[PDB]
Ligand binder design. Structure first.
Ligand code: HEM
Ligand code: HEM
Ligand code: HEM
Ligand code: HEM
Ligand code: HEM
Ligand code: HEM
Ligand code: HEM
Ligand code: HEM
Ligand code: HEM
Ligand code: HEM
Ligand code: HEM
Lengths: 142, 140, 145, 146, 140, 146, 142, 142, 146, 145, 140
């Protein structure tokens, strides 16, 4: 789905959970700590950016690059032509990197769970987030 | 006039200055108080909406309709086709009210008077361009 | 009372968070179009009654949509002053009496379409307070219709 | 010049107030004006962006490049409260721009002018002094090596 | 332009907005910040007074001299013969600075931007007339 | 009538002050008096509760039915700050009462009277006006369909 | 066990963790999030009440019905005759629903853990809670 | 590693997370709850100190004895001769107790994770903590 | 005497201000002076510590014993806000000292004097009255049985 | 300005948390030695230029280390009063002009060694504020060198 | 004199009394104000560092160097070999300043005067012993 109303809700709640400054590292840490616990083999994919120490400066820069890419796509959710071009470029940066296809549903689950933990679970629209997050990762994976 | 960058600046400063709830009513009353203080001849044009008492419900309701229209126009400043159609609708409604150019120049100066007194930052250049954009669409 | 001060305050706060001049016009049009889509199906009112004919890509219709929700926006933000709000609703009532086809049932359908769309973009909305206050707005606009 | 604690607090707040993902139809407008200004001041710079359809500015391809580049500044601006991570990011950005033939350090001086021209037009409350110093602190980290 | 009634209004609102002591310095820095934000080409004209750092003593001193001159002119708005002689002196000093009409229009919009943000009441009509009175005396 | 924000805040506080699980030997007393009042005002209603030993009020079977029914009101009253969930719950309660032969909407008008008689006697600080409107908002959701 | 003193402690702490209004949803979310993580097959038992989206209005109503039933039993802990009648009725609503016998110890563990997280772990009487919670579920299960 | 600068950082952050009074029980509870979840067989090692109920007074005293021993070693990190003597005595209290060799890396992971959760993850030096904690447990285990 | 709520709050704060692991080269100094004082007041007590090289005070072996013993007091002092756990700990410490031949209850009266002599010299802000009563509450729990 | 009031305040607070008289002298020596180790390798300055000859076990060198960081400690804590700090740096500048071998580059190396060691014992340090303020201290001490 | 227990007490009370940032400057000025108030003949010894105005930057800088040296010495009180070498360095610097025993006794009484006025607890016994330890190392 990801209706026009869903995109406004996701954009608002993403900006809130993503936030400004170091608050972005708080959201990122929730995502990578959840992803690596549920999928321990994903950490090996980030050996070049010191995935063994997610608190290092090197991995935090990587983490904020990824969240910056997600923020980039979330902001363009209501601008589909630009979104497709953003996703096509993100696909080129991930293809043939050896990323398992299961990592993108797992990352989606971790990102949604981290946003839910930050903005509050009450009335949280899992359907809007899953459907809009799936539109993003389906343009990146493969 | 009123480029895409200026539109964002004006939309941000208007929403913050216009406020919410009863603040919109006090803001709207202040706007027409400044209009009357700038052009005394404009007060009589509103004799049909209880202008004799500017705190009355009837005149407060008229002030909110005007500032609410200003609110809906600024909200659509970045959708050129939508605001042009809306301004054309407003131009049709104002054509029979015996208004001249100085009436709209006074309203503009009233806007330039009340809006910045509810702000810490105000770009009168962008507001001048973008108000002119709106007023010219209504005046004819 | 129906639409108490507490009800009005939370309705206004949630409405202005979802609808204000700092947002993109495309976003406000997207909300208003969704409101009208809901209104069309619950009321059965013909879209040809409106300029642009309900077409979301017609600038004439998006302006008509902007005018209608703006009228609701003005009424909502005036909810904490009943005397002022009564006057705003009375003016809207006189305007719609001169419009052939406007019934009190349809005005209720449109006011309820506002509340339901707000709860879709803001699922934490106080939908009871929204029901009471939009019913109060609907009764004033469609009085005698 | 030094991007002080008060500088980055001011710059980060005013930037995020304009660039936040909560708003729509702002990023493209801002990012397009930045590159429109860059090409207006350095006609030779447009040739460095032939892979992103620079001659068709309203294409989704060029719009996405503008948003992509400017969002990179948003990532770096919001790192100003963690300069240890910022230094890692600016080193990462430097290696990416060294691998691009023709990108010189003087181009960032033109990019600074483009932002210095666009931001005052768009950001209610804008401190050019704070912006110039904190943009320099980020841009100097990227343009080192080229 | 700028009648005796408008002069009193502008004198009152200027003195209150301009303030005292360090508030004058922050006000004067804000004025030139808005000028540069409105017309970026005007910043280079001040390269001789430390405009590279707008919080420096050298540039803050220049901003106070300009607003102080604005202060002394508004103070003498109701003494037509005195302010005309003073404006003629200022016009002689500015004639060699390669300034145009848009420079003074931008400064005016900067004044219309910063002055009302330090006030609860602002009459932009009277300020428009009386600023034009002052600026035309200097621009030539 | 409308159960306003101030109404439900008042009603939820005074109800929970009486019904809280932290206290003992209150729920049975309150719930028994409610049903004693209901039978006193509608002698025919007692026949609808023949499966819970209505003719032996002090039995554990009937006491548990009273507590069970009134606690259903506690669940609904404490949903007044999340009406989206309340509407789901009131729809659930409506389907359960439609499957019970003989339960009519006028019976809830008698149940409202029983609570309107019991609560003033038991709740220090009681606003009958707020109670009548917020009970109606819950009861009207259940009694719809029958 | 579940002595007369245990029942007073459990009643007091239950009311505190259960609370009023939307605070009950905070406790419920702790229970279902813990139960489904430790026993993923339990979520399928709640397909009719949208167990896949615990944040939906449909599941929250179900969650509050369950917690209401537990609150009902906790409040009657010191009134054994009424408690037994309450438990007998709750047994009729769960029998032949296909509920695995392991779900009730797991639910007890999640409920106790959620209460412990809400009122504080220091001095928390696990023996009183386990023994009194076991008296409740043993009347429901089977 | 565990450089002289690492020892100052670990001492400062340990004292902060360890704290005073009942705050020490908050840190201990984080350690044992994490350790027992990741290594369920470790709980059986503490049957004599009521490991089944970590909230009991008996286990809390044990927990504070252990954390007291760790605090003892952390405080002496910059006094290597005394540290070695402290570790030799701690080895005598654990040898032939049947403690699996995997328990000490697991305890280190739980202790570091609990300290990280208490003082904050941002800029947390996992390398200093791992290297200095490894010097401690390597003197105890075996 | 009673170690009151105000007593243990004062004692725990001043002790932790001196004994915290955040500082260096304090624990050994304090712990050594305590045992130096104990041996100065009871020359026979030194024989009970022959397994920790009491005749070579500056050895790492004896220093570690001093720190180990005094840190046991730190553990007990910081339990004063949870006396249920303190009682479990003091019972644990009592069984360990009963299994040590020659340790008598009068020795703790000498240990109290050693702390009463060392602490005023080392702790800025020291309340001997509060210390004497709260040390007694801990020491009496250990020395019970011997 | 370079090393603003806000920069100075956070630098002072982080410095005094890491370096103060309540800490053990061995700890302060360990920090100062690490600072000098970093300075020796980045500046190439011979340790024989200092009393004790850079030997960390020489009491003469640990006292020399104590004097140098104390001079930096005094300058750091005076950062919020530029007039007083300028005078402190001017006195240090005159002292080092009379010392053969002290260059402005080496003074910068030592000031940067302070910031890098602080960020090792306090990884949350505001290293940009540290860079700006230690550069200001370095320019005053090594003026003309 | 000044045993390991006393050193910890003095280090704790000094760090708390000396404070941070500008508090160190006011503390250091107060110390020399008390010195001059106790021994008026000691003021002239500082004529080379702007003692004519005790709020000047030059004299405030001198006061911080002296209290900063006191700060570095107390910091190393528990490292006997390090502080002995540092005191010997200071003794070499003071040998040519024509100071006597009463100068150092007055400075001590000044320290005993200012330090406790910034504290809630003060052990003058430990401070007497440990100051004497420091002063004797410098005086010769
Ligand atoms: C919406 C989802 C995602 C977005 C927006 C995203 C975006 C990004 C971005 C912007 C970068 C920076 C590339 C660079 O600068 O070199 C990156 C790097 C990377 N990402 Fe993704 N990513 C997403 C999902 C994932 C997932 C699910 C995985 C693996 C399971 C993954 C693995 C990686 C890897 C391995 C790198 C390279 C890091 C390095 O070595 O520098 N990404 N990603
Ligand atoms: C510049 C932006 C303006 C906007 C957005 C605006 C908008 C509106 C709106 C929405 C109404 C309500 C009509 C209705 O609902 O019946 C109205 C009425 C009116 N406006 Fe304007 N207007 C503007 C300028 C002016 C000016 C400058 C004047 C006169 C100086 C003016 C005079 C009137 C009059 C006389 C009425 C009708 C009063 C009556 O109903 O008795 N308008 N306008
Ligand atoms: C909450 C409900 C409603 C509100 C707040 C509202 C408000 C408004 C407003 C502000 C306008 C613009 C008046 C102007 O041009 O100055 C308008 C126009 C109009 N309304 Fe409504 N309205 C509502 C419901 C309805 C319904 C239910 C219908 C039809 C069944 C309807 C039919 C129309 C039509 C056809 C126009 C255009 C008239 C024209 O173009 O001259 N409205 N309404
Ligand atoms: C603060 C200033 C700048 C920032 C933050 C920045 C950042 C970025 C980012 C994030 C990308 C996307 C990389 C990718 O998707 O593979 C990019 C691409 C690029 N940038 Fe920069 N940039 C800056 C200034 C400049 C300037 C001044 C130039 C040249 C005049 C330049 C030349 C390029 C080029 C040629 C590309 C490749 C675009 C393509 O072919 O896809 N950048 N930059
Ligand atoms: C509108 C009211 C204005 C007033 C009252 C005013 C007054 C003054 C005064 C008092 C000085 C100080 C001259 C001196 O003491 O050396 C000055 C200098 C100057 N002003 Fe104006 N001025 C005005 C407008 C402008 C505008 C609009 C501009 C340019 C956009 C401008 C550009 C300059 C320049 C370039 C200088 C000399 C800078 C230098 O010394 O290097 N002035 N003005
Ligand atoms: C706010 C008002 C009411 C609420 C919240 C409520 C709620 C409930 C609840 C929770 C049950 C337990 C269902 C079960 O355990 O299977 C129940 C049962 C029942 N209720 Fe209602 N009820 C209300 C009013 C009424 C009224 C007014 C009547 C009839 C006069 C009624 C008739 C019944 C009957 C016959 C049963 C079946 C009892 C049995 O045989 O076990 N209810 N109700
Ligand atoms: C003290 C423990 C429990 C209590 C008090 C309790 C109580 C309740 C209550 C009051 C309902 C509402 C029934 C209705 O209105 O139709 C319910 C529904 C239900 N419960 Fe339980 N329950 C408990 C434990 C469990 C456990 C452990 C499971 C499964 C592992 C479970 C599975 C279900 C299911 C499947 C439903 C039906 C939901 C539906 O489809 O509407 N319950 N429970
Ligand atoms: C730095 C790491 C550790 C330290 C400092 C430490 C220290 C201590 C201390 C001081 C005691 C008290 C002994 C007594 O008073 O009788 C103790 C007891 C004990 N510890 Fe450790 N310990 C550590 C790690 C571990 C680990 C990893 C395990 C098991 C996986 C473990 C298992 C035990 C057991 C079984 C006891 C005996 C409890 C009893 O029955 O009284 N320890 N430890
Ligand atoms: C508050 C007072 C005291 C506390 C908290 C305390 C605590 C401790 C602790 C923690 C140990 C280490 C046990 C081990 O590592 O196996 C210990 C050992 C010992 N304590 Fe105590 N103690 C206290 C007073 C005394 C006194 C007054 C005496 C005798 C005069 C004493 C005699 C001993 C002996 C002989 C050992 C054995 C040391 C060895 O051989 O390793 N204790 N004590
Ligand atoms: C931030 C940087 C520096 C600070 C704050 C500083 C400060 C000091 C201080 C306070 C003293 C003691 C003066 C006295 O005995 O009264 C000193 C001595 C000394 N400094 Fe520096 N200094 C710095 C950098 C350097 C550098 C880079 C060098 C050499 C390349 C150097 C060489 C020396 C030497 C050799 C002495 C001993 C002179 C003697 O024993 O007479 N210093 N310094
Ligand atoms: C008791 C602890 C003392 C300490 C730690 C101390 C330390 C210092 C220090 C660090 C300097 C700076 C030298 C330089 O950098 O050039 C200095 C200078 C000086 N001190 Fe002391 N001092 C102490 C006692 C005294 C006393 C008691 C007197 C006189 C009553 C005194 C008189 C002077 C003089 C005259 C100077 C040089 C003033 C000048 O440079 O013109 N000192 N002292």
């Amino acid at each position: 789905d990801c209706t026009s109303l869903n995109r406004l809700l996701v954009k608002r709640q993403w900006a809130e959970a993503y936030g400004e400054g170091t608050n972005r590292e708080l959201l990122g840490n929730r995502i990578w700590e959840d992803l690596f616990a549920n999928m321990p083999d994903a950490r090996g994919l980030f050996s070049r950016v010191n995935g063994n120490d997610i608190d290092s400066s090197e991995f935090q820069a990587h983490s904020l690059r990824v969240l910056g890419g997600l923020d980039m796509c979330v902001a363009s959710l209501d601008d589909v032509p630009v979104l497709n071009a953003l996703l096509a470029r993100l696909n080129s940066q991930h293809d043939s990197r050896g990323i398992p296809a299961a990592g993108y549903p797992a990352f989606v689950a971790s990102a949604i769970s981290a946003v839910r933990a930050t903005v509050g679970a009450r009335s949280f629209d899992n359907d809007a987030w899953n459907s809009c997050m799936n539109q993003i990762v389906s343009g990146i994976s493969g | 006039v009123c480029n895409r960058l200026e539109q964002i600046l004006v939309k941000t400063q208007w929403a913050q200055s216009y406020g919410e709830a009863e603040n919109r009513a006090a803001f709207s009353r202040d706007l027409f108080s400044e209009l009357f203080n700038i052009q005394g001849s404009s007060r009589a044009l509103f004799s049909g909406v209880g202008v004799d008492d500017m705190n009355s419900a009837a005149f407060t309701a008229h002030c909110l309709r005007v500032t609410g229209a200003l609110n809906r126009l600024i909200s659509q400043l970045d959708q050129q086709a939508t605001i042009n159609a809306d301004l054309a609708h407003l131009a049709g409604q104002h054509a029979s009210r015996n208004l001249d150019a100085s009436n709209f120049a006074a309203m503009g100066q009233a806007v330039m008077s009340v809006v910045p007194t509810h702000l810490d930052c105000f770009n009168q250049h962008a507001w001048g361009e973008c108000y002119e954009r709106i007023a010219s669409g209504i005046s004819g | 009372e129906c639409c108490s001060r507490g009800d009005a305050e939370v309705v206004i706060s949630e409405w202005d968070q979802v609808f204000n001049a700092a947002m993109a016009g495309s976003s406000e049009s997207a909300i208003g179009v969704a409101i009208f889509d809901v209104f069309f199906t619950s009321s059965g009112v013909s879209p040809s009654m409106f300029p642009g004919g309900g077409d979301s890509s017609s600038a004439e219709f998006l302006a008509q949509v902007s005018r209608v929700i703006s009228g609701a926006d003005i009424a909502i933000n005036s909810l904490t002053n009943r005397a002022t709000c009564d006057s705003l609703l009375s003016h809207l009532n006189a305007q719609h009496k001169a419009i052939s086809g406007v019934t009190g049932a349809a005005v209720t359908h449109l006011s309820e379409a506002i509340s339901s769309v707000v709860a879709q973009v803001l699922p934490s909305a106080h939908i009871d307070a929204w029901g009471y206050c939009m019913a109060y707005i609907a009764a004033g606009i469609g009085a005698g219709l | 010049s030094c991007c002080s604690s008060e500088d980055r607090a001011n710059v980060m707040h005013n930037w995020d107030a304009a660039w936040s993902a909560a708003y729509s139809d702002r990023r493209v407008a801002l990012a397009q004006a930045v590159f429109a200004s860059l090409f207006s001041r350095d006609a030779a710079a447009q040739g460095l962006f032939s892979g992103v359809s620079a001659d068709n500015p309203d294409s989704a391809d060029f719009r996405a490049h503008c948003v992509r580049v400017v969002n990179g500044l948003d990532v770096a601006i919001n790192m100003l409260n963690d300069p240890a991570v910022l230094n890692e990011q600016l080193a990462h950005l430097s290696a990416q721009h060294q691998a691009r033939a023709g990108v010189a350090a003087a181009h960032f001086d033109v990019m600074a002018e483009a932002f210095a021209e666009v931001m005052p037009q768009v950001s209610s409350c804008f401190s050019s002094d704070s912006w110039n110093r904190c943009f320099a602190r980020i841009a100097n980290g990227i343009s080192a090596g080229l």
